[PDB]
């Protein structure tokens, strides 16, 4: 198993892992995994951590002939209704040599006690489109089996993970709240139609 990236400041603070980490510039894909996991000399410059904010930072110098830095921006607002702190990755920023490409990250959220896991944090629709660009972009990314934890970490071991895929989805709830509503209505239809009867006799 590839060792997780572990941002260390007085103790381990941010743990990060994937089955496969890859990116593309102008749709030319590269595998970053051997350039990242278990690499003792890995360049974590510009990384930071706080009680209520965190910034994981991964810098590659030989990548696409340019110094490229990947920023993960994570928040942990208290949420009043839920009454638990909830972790939310807010943005992923590709700090390229010339400019910054911005990706919002969609469903990357979980209760603070627990970590987060997803099968495909990615900019591609074939792999869920969790990374969103509101504008045209030269960049693509995929984190196959992405797992992250960035507050109240203990040791180098991840805590239990909330998965990005539960038993239901917004599309399924809208689907079921129609289907398993109109099947109540069709059952009324079916109960009356199946209650049709015919005479056993006819008149003199």
């Amino acid at each position: 198993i590839h060792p997780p990236v572990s941002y260390n400041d007085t103790a381990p603070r941010i743990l990060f892992w994937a089955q496969n980490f890859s990116v593309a510039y102008k749709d030319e894909w590269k595998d970053l995994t051997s350039l990242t996991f278990g690499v003792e000399n890995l360049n974590l410059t510009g990384s930071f951590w706080n009680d209520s904010f965190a910034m994981l930072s991964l810098t590659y110098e030989p990548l696409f002939g340019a110094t490229v830095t990947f920023k993960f921006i994570l928040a942990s607002r208290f949420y009043p209704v839920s009454a638990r702190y909830w972790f939310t990755m807010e943005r992923l920023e590709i700090h390229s040599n010339g400019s910054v490409a911005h990706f919002n990250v969609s469903q990357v959220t979980g209760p603070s006690i627990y970590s987060f896991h997803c099968e495909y944090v990615s900019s591609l629709s074939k792999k869920g489109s969790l990374l969103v660009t509101n504008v045209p972009s030269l960049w693509q990314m995929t984190l196959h089996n992405f797992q992250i934890q960035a507050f109240n970490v203990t040791g180098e071991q991840f805590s239990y993970a909330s998965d990005c895929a539960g038993f239901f989805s917004p599309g399924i709830w809208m689907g079921l709240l129609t289907t398993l509503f109109m099947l109540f209505i069709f059952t009324y239809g079916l109960h009356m139609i199946l209650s049709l009867k015919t005479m056993d006799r006819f008149d003199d």
């Binding site: 896991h117 495909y120 792999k127 797992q147 895929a165 989805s169």
Partner: protein
């Protein structure tokens, strides 16, 4: 696993589940209803039920 990595639950999992749950509940109701209907079908032996 030494790092306590997640159970790798896939995307589409809500879709697999709502396929398998509702297909199996449909099949299991179709079996149960049919089985109830044949098990409680009238055996129709009126020529001897009274003698």
């Amino acid at each position: 696993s030494p790092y306590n990595l997640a159970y790798k639950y896939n995307l589409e999992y809500s879709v697999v589940f709502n396929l398998v749950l509702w297909i199996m509940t449909g099949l299991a109701l179709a079996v149960i209803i049919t089985s109830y209907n044949i098990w409680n079908m009238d055996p129709g032996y009126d020529s001897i039920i009274y003698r």
